Structure 1
Amino acid sequence: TTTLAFRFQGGIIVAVDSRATAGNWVASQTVKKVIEINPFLLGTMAGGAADCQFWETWLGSQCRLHELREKERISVAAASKILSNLVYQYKGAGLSMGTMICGYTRKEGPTIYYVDSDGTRLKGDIFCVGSGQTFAYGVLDSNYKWDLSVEDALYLGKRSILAAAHRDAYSGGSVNLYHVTEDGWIYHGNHDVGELFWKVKEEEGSFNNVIG
């Protein structure tokens, strides 16, 4: 698994791989590792697939009840803390979660919270989670700037997953891209790693080690 999210001038870029593995066996290459909490909030799936899917779908329900009662979009801070307080209650029971809660509100601006199953809740500009996180962080750290365009930021997210997909055995299949704006998130398509690798190799001149 490789999931990343980062803040920039244009909002938030969220990029995930799509591979699920049981041992060395590849169960699926079509897994959705971005959970569409609601039209303004995104969550990333790392650790337990069920744990993330279930509790981030539940979070969407809690967020809907908040805006029905308060007549105001829930803040990313409030949404993240509902989930972090819930997993903290279950601490020691064996929940497995490594997620980024991503939203863009007027008050906060673009905001990312890393939330995990041992109760950690961290605000940050860049987060990578999964078996392939170290590979993604490498491409991100060296190329990341705040003043990145939306086009280049989307590529950087896609390129960082491809880096992890290549090296990490437990990451690959396809890349799912999201751009989070104040008005909501926009899906930027499913990109097969098979076709993307050869396309990126040729155009970028990277991956010389690989014959193509």
Structure 2
Amino acid sequence: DCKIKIAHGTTTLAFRFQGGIIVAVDSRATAGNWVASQTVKAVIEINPFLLGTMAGGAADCQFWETWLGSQCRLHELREKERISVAAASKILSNLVYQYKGAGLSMGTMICGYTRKEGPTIYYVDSDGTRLKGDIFCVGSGQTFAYGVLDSNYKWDLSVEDALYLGKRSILAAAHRDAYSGGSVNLYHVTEDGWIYHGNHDVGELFWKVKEEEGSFNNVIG
């Protein structure tokens, strides 16, 4: 090995559906194969209507998304109006684009609701890509989350079923991806704003899901 290992963090998802937006993330940070933390907050609460997910460099994401929150606060002070998800995401995407090539490592998703836009999700990463979309999974365990999410996703999911699918998709990635785990943090974004749906430790959640759902037959029960 050479060079310091800095924390790299988290598997995240967020999908749009009938009842708004679900956002789910894991809580693990790793420095190589060393599990650095299992209690990382990978969701930033920018404002009562805006969320930001974090993946890649922990510092990069944590620093620039809290900075993003300051820029969004300054927008509503100057314009007497809450910033649009598009504008918020574009502030971040234009920022990282100025640092393109410098070595920033960020995979973020700006999720929120406004009147003019409705529920909106924007994928923003460190090489300058900015994409509007209904479903995104970002992080080292994104593919594992996609596998479960896509195969069970419908627009007409209920709030209860959607919350679970988001939770279950992170769990799937937490299980298979070595660099994902710890616990699941759930959020539900509606017209009235975001609602926190608890921290769910994989230690208890896996066995609870295995027993009740009858899934995870690969594992010794």
Query: What TM-score do you get using the length of structure 2 for normalisation?
Result: 0.94
Task: State the Cα distance separating 1:72 from its structure 2 match.
Answer: 1.3
Q: Distance in 2 between matches of 1:176 and 1:6?
A: 15
Distance 1:30 1:77 in 2: 30
Shift of residue 116, structure 1, vs aligned partner: 0.5
Unaligned stretches of 5+ residues in structure 2: 1-9
Distance in structure 2 (CA, Å) of the matches to 1:163 and 1:154: 14
CA distance in 1, matches of 2:147, 2:118: 26
Distance 1:134 1:177 in 2: 19
Q: Does 1:89 align with 2:98?
A: yes
Using the TM superposition, give the Cα deviation of residue 74 of structure 1 relative to its aligned residue in structure 2, in angstroms: 0.8
CA distance in 1, matches of 2:154, 2:168: 15
User: Aligned ranges for residues 125-164 of structure 1 at < 5 Å?
Assistant: 125-164=134-173
Deviation at 1:65, TM superposition (A): 1.0
- CA deviations 1:108-157 (Å, max 9, x no partner) are 11100000011100000000011110010011111111111111000000
CA distance, structure 1, for counterparts of residue 198 and residue 100 of structure 2: 36
> C-alpha separation between the residues in 1 aligned to 2:34 and 2:96?
29
SS of the counterpart of 1:201?
A: helix
| Runs of 4+ residues over 3 Å off in structure 1 | none
The offset of 1:206, in angstroms, is: 0.4
CA–CA distance in 2 between the matches of 1:52 and 1:90? 13
Post-superposition offset of 1:182: 1.8
Q: Distance in 2 between matches of 1:207 and 1:90?
A: 43
Offset of residue 69 of structure 1: 1.3
1:21 maps to 2:13: no
Distance 1:67 1:22 in 2: 38
SS in 2 for 1:27: strand
Match of 2:84 in 1: 75
Aligned residues: 212
Q: Residues 14-52 of structure 1: CA distance to partner in whole angstroms, max 9, x if unpaired?
A: 000101111111111101111111221111111111111
User: In 1, Cα distance between the equivalents of 2:81 and 2:32?
Assistant: 45
Cα offset, 1:103, TM superposition: 0.6
C-alpha displacement at 1:211, in angstroms? 1.5
Deviation at 1:71, TM superposition (A): 1.2
Tell me, in whole angstroms, the C-alpha distance in 2 between the residues paired with 1:145 and 1:72: 33
Q: C-alpha separation between the residues in 2 aligned to 1:172 and 1:112?
A: 24
Q: 2 CA distance for matches of 1:183 and 1:64?
A: 19
SS in 1 for 2:136: strand
CA-atom RMSD in angstroms = 0.8
- In structure 1, the gaps of 5 or more residues are none
- Matched residues in 2 for 1:98 and 1:105: separation? 23
The 3-state SS of whatever aligns with 1:107 is coil
